[PDB]
Symmetry: C3
Subunit: 532 residues, 3 copies
């Protein structure tokens, strides 16, 4: 029918209508709306700038490029995480500061539907907004869904530790996208007054970070972190970041005489060159050959003094900042298959013994950060139970998931709670039918498994059993009610308690019901073990 | 003693040149910047104000012409120039300059009428220095300004969106006019009386500016010689993304997104882009490959800043510059010059019906005649004689009418009906300065009026009495127009105003008024295209 | 606990260094940025303010020195340095830094006089890190600031127009002064009491800054050591365009226009410009061919921003804020250093009047003397007697007077006549830190006063009590001047002001007042050149 034409600050955008089985009002979908000026040339390694306005009508009907990244890794993850039946193949480009909108509202009348801005995960190295289709969630819960993109890897996080290149460019991209939503979402029938930010993994961590950043203040009113927070150490760079910067510059064929000299040279480099450098660094890949403490898993969030004035641990300790309803959750087996798979973890055996276990835990230093002097104690506290080598492996993946997501999430959850703001938690346990063929059937609640329920995968992909369909229906109700009231609860849905002193949380799965003291035992074990 | 003048951005030093018999010397200034050199980041972006210089800027040397095909550019400068010897020119992206020729007495105050010249060249080649305004300045006592603008890739690359809207060259023309309004007074010129005029692409430019709201108060009269906004070859209609992409690919750039192409194209050296230009083989009749997919030019587009609609839609709205406008054409626009420059296959010097239709199709990029209408067209023009030589000449008539004759007249009529003063002419004469390679039978070839308009007879050699007179007349007709938005004057054949009677001036050895210019042709084509 | 100071742009962290005989440690801050790195498009453009930093910048490591001949640079550093062992430096275009040495107790509120040092090196080489301000700071309780500024092509390339005015290094010097005004208070200094001083090109810089309306309020006292704005070699007169083109071609650039050259040179890499720098042989003397065509060393030009006209025209103009100015020279300015570093053909040890005139002519790029005047010049100095050996020395006194002696006095007199406190001196002493390859007969060689000024006798070893007392006295005089505009004080021989009696101080083992410095020489030359 007559295509939707929304008028924005920078110009008119033409999208398209797409109907979803069971909904009369078709959803207006806008693809590739620029929220900032392409970070090309001298704009590389600098805060994002406003997009130039355009004349006539902009055709927002093609999927935007995904920010330069490992094209193979990128696609692999996209296929593994997409909620649509046909994974969209994406093109690489530094000109990737776009966002996609899905509005279930009737643009012929004025609406103020709650807005949900999704920040994709990908270890801040890969990923894209197009991987996530917001059609189902928009129609079902009558909410405006916005998936956004931000610079990754070298382009979005290169830091020199100083003012010549603070870092966190990707994070600034995220904040810029949030301002754009403030200034334009009303045109798409959304209520700028109710913007909810939510993300998974690195996206969860980004959400966790904005919640702690003054720059993001008043840009959102509710937040959701799925399998990822600011205390998930692997994504936050503590200490002097100068060494990493130099290594990158050297690998790219640049002198390190000074900071400005390094940045100037990296700006002259072409995209293909910075990509080749990215590939040489072997990011997102477990480094077995070489000292574990020097291994650099990725380029991430730093304490730039602009976005983050100090460390997350210190930031969440304060109690004099703008608070918002925050939902933090994790999956049953955050390290059951997906992550170990992508990083090429040495587990082609199926079993593991105490001795070898202490070996991987050390090699995994860049992800867990457990001192070689604590390794023995840690590994024992987990594998000292059974003599079974197979059950040991399972407890090992438990060990890592807790350090990476479990404990960091509960702690963040607690502090937010002790800060006087509504806090909610959940533990997702369910093996989706859209899992990989290589993923063992015994893995339930793997990293990313909740994505399919959150983005209504059952209503776009085939095979979903009636059970899986309802699960997704329930999940979207919670997320959408949360977006609406800052409380997930609603009639016809299992009661979800607040994460107060009793530490109540919601176990989401075949059997969704409330529980208590999530990871209580582990938070204490690690809080002590780490305290050295 | 060297004339010096205070401009908005600093003092400039020029030179005095006297023309035969004239006591009052013409103060000439060559290579005055009117914009910041469009280099690096500034490429494919709107012209920017020039930076002021501290002391006295020496303006006594000719500026480089905008990057273009060195060969074609020189050839055209030689065929169109009106000075004795053609001057060698340098190429550069640093070409945003304008030359001034003022007959005024810079010591006292003057407000002579200003005439700004926009050279032609298909928007691909050309230069201001090609035209010496000495004769016209002295003879008609007007200040003559010749301006340059970005050409080809540099001045017209468009991604069809905000990353590279296009019409950079037209923006340069505007900036140049802007500069005249702020400085011309210092050169003895009256900024309140500015006439823009040019031929061919420069004629189309004048036409485009006459429809653009950006040039609102930048000129007061307009003259388009052999070229208007309706010469379809110069104005790209529809989506231009395809040609943008072809250019990027030819230059070794990815076409991922507009921003990607633009950025890549900016990282290219002037020389790589010129090489890309040479690769594209513009301004040449492409006899191989589908005619519908050949871009002989990179022209004007509907950018949304300079032009908000197509020139057609802009005429209808009777929404444009209601200033005195003079539109004229020459007897044989496709006489020799253009087909000669485009390597048209007419060696035999004859032409039968079939070959005519076949050639007309290949000429698609120039006339846009649907393959299904080619026969009616060829029949209407050629089915009248069995003389293969006449068919061949009638074929050049047809191309001429589609490119200039018809387009020009429709423009005049619309300009007329909008209530603004309008005038038309048809120049028919063979300048003695024509290239020796051009047959002596070609009368009123493309650009043939240039020699009268710029006083070639007074700077070059060999002009007969008849020719000398012709130039005097044309220059006066032109200068009078700049003064009153009316060409008439004492001692000049009467030029009726192009009103509903459609009176126009037939300029030549014998100059006399006539009516209904290309009237029947306009009717035929309007109908043929209505299908 | 290390020194942490807060400045407008952010917090800096230094280190304490104790000096023998002073309880309060001196806080030293190395490599604080006073401008934004002049890289990429910022090349050949005035310095821009540095960007603020978010935490505590570590300022405890020497900064790189502006790109220059690494060999000449290191050499001149070793020869001039006042510290025990010369510090090896790195080359970088990112060199706009300054070092601070404050003796003030930063936990208190001190406001001591500030002395900003501008090193020399023909504007081609040199570094701030060469001069350790420890001794001077502690001994005279003043804050010492050693600054850096762009050198060679980077700091002085000029097209003679607005596309690259030039004087970039001078604009850096001014920007360093601006920085000092906005931040020095947090280092214990009094922003209202800033004295700029330097030697050679650094002296010429001080001299230039004193005439520039750009620094009319950034300092309160000036000291030019062996070098003023009248030392022709460093200041350019006439069209500079040729030099620009010669540099552009040596770098492999087109020369179509100014913008073209500047644009192309901005695309060059630091190494490429360094390769170009070396190819030019800037500080060496050419013995072959016509001397007038010798490489005109890069230098100060009349840009129209820093200097509105030649220095000789600004001093008579009496147009420049009046501040106390101290101009001084050394006994044998062309004694050994400058010649040795320029590879002068004097290995002979003797010189007749024939080779002298030949050599003098060959010295045109330095002394700038007409060929028809060479005989007089020679005859006047060497004609005295025979003894070719005694003549080479009279030849050296010749060069010295033309480069520093005459210019200095002239400048002093003009300053004095401008009704401003003026002081002159002649340094005649041979530091024990002299090079081993320096003749024992050379006393008061170029750069010899630096060792007393920067208290070398308290950093290097072996200073005799006489040399120590000389250093104590010079520092006393300098600091006294920095805080009163008058060098005199308790425990010091009287230094008369340079009034009409032209009284100046003779500093050395024996320090006493004298009169009419180079008076006869200034007469001979002012005259000889008049012809
Ligand atoms: C008319 C048109 O194709 N618009 C498209 C633009 C252009 O492709 C870019 O601006 C490059 O020109 O942006 C998208 O491709 C994108 O980035 O997702 C989507 C949109 O459909
Ligand atoms: C002093 C001087 O030569 N000015 C001239 C400049 C320079 O030649 C270029 O900018 C290269 O510096 O530009 C012109 O040549 C030009 O292109 O029209 C004309 C002008 O008279
Ligand atoms: C917080 N993240 C966790 C551990 C560190 C970081 C990267 C990893 O990434 C993912 O799960 C992504 O989904 C991904 C990235 C790259 C390739 C494949 C998959 C998961
Ligand atoms: C084909 N697989 C081999 C043997 C059976 C099956 C599961 C096992 O994987 C794991 O325990 C981890 O889940 C893992 C580690 C590394 C890569 C992929 C998956 C490794
Ligand atoms: C409006 N223009 C007419 C027809 C289309 C366009 C190009 C052509 O150009 C010329 O006559 C130029 O004068 C030229 C260009 C290239 C080479 C030689 C001469 C004449
Ligand atoms: C016998 N002819 C002469 C020499 C070869 C052949 C074609 C040429 O004509 C052209 O190049 C022009 O295309 C032209 C000019 C004038 C009339 C007709 C055609 C003129
Ligand atoms: C007024 N100066 C004199 C003559 C021109 C100018 C530079 C020269 O050199 C020096 O002062 C340095 O001592 C130096 C720098 C670079 C190379 C060699 C020597 C001495
Ligand atoms: C390589 N040089 C040769 C032999 C050793 C050294 C000094 C000498 O120098 C001269 O004759 C100079 O003319 C001079 C230099 C320093 C002071 C006075 C005179 C000539
Ligand atoms: C927008 O782009 C799509 C796909 O590129 C195309 O099919 C559609 O026609 C365009 N919209 C219009 C009508 O301009
Ligand atoms: C400052 O830099 C110096 C030398 O680079 C280094 O030794 C010192 O540890 C640094 N100080 C701090 C604490 O950053
Ligand atoms: C133009 O005049 C300037 C200043 O007199 C001079 O430098 C330059 O050489 C002159 N150019 C010509 C055309 O001779
Ligand atoms: Cl992630």
């Amino acid at each position: 029918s007559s295509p939707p034409v929304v008028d924005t600050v920078h110009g008119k955008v033409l999208g398209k209508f797409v109907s979803l089985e069971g909904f009369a009002q078709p959803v207006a979908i806008f693809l590739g709306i620029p929220f900032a000026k392409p970070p090309l040339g001298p704009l590389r390694f600098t805060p994002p700038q406003p997009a130039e306005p355009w004349s006539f009508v902009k055709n927002a009907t093609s999927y935007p490029p995904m920010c330069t990244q490992d094209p193979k890794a990128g696609q692999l993850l996209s296929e593994l995480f997409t909620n649509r039946k046909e994974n969209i193949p994406l093109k690489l480009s530094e000109d990737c500061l776009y966002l996609n909108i899905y509005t279930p509202a009737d643009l012929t009348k004025k609406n103020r539907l709650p807005v949900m801005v999704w920040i994709h995960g990908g270890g801040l190295m890969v990923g894209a907004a197009s991987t996530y289709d917001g059609l189902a969630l928009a129609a079902h819960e009558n909410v405006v869904v916005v998936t956004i993109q931000y610079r990754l890897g070298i382009w979005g996080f290169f830091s020199t530790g100083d003012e010549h290149s603070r870092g966190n460019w990707g994070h600034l991209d995220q904040v810029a996208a949030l301002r754009w939503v403030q200034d334009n979402i009303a045109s798409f029938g959304g209520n700028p007054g109710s913007v909810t930010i939510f993300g998974e993994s690195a996206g969860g961590e980004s959400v966790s970070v904005l919640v702690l950043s003054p720059l993001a203040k008043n840009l959102f009113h509710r937040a959701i972190s799925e399998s990822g927070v600011a205390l998930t150490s692997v994504l936050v760079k503590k200490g002097d970041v100068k060494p990493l910067a130099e290594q990158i510059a050297i690998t790219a064929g640049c002198k390190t005489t000074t900071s400005a000299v390094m940045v100037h040279c990296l700006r002259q480099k072409t995209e293909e060159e910075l990509l080749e450098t990215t590939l040489k660094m072997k990011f997102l890949s477990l480094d077995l050959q070489g000292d574990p403490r020097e291994s650099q898993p990725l380029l991430g969030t730093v304490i730039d003094g602009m976005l983050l004035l100090k460390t997350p641990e210190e930031l969440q300790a304060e109690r004099n900042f703008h608070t918002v309803p925050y939902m933090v959750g994790i999956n049953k087996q955050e390290f059951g298959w997906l992550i170990p798979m992508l990083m090429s973890y040495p587990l082609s055996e199926g079993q593991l013994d105490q001795k070898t276990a202490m070996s991987l835990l050390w090699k995994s230093y860049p992800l867990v950060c457990i001192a070689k002097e604590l390794i023995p104690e840690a590994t024992e506290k987990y594998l000292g139970g059974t003599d079974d080598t197979v059950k040991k492996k399972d407890l090992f993946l438990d060990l890592i998931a807790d350090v990476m997501f479990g404990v960091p999430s509960v702690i963040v959850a607690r502090n937010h709670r002790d800060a006087g703001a509504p806090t909610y938690m959940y533990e997702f346990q369910y093996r989706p039918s859209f899992s990989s063929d290589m993923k063992p059937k015994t893995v339930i609640g793997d990293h990313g498994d909740e994505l399919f329920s959150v983005f209504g995968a059952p209503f776009l992909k085939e095979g979903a059993s009636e059970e899986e369909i309802r699960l997704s229906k329930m999940v979207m109700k919670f997320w959408a009610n949360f977006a609406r009231n800052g409380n997930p609860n609603g009639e016809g849905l299992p009661h979800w308690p607040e994460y107060n002193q009793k530490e109540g949380y919601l176990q989401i799965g075949a059997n969704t019901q409330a529980a208590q003291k999530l990871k209580d035992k582990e938070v204490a074990f690690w809080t002590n073990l780490f305290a050295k």
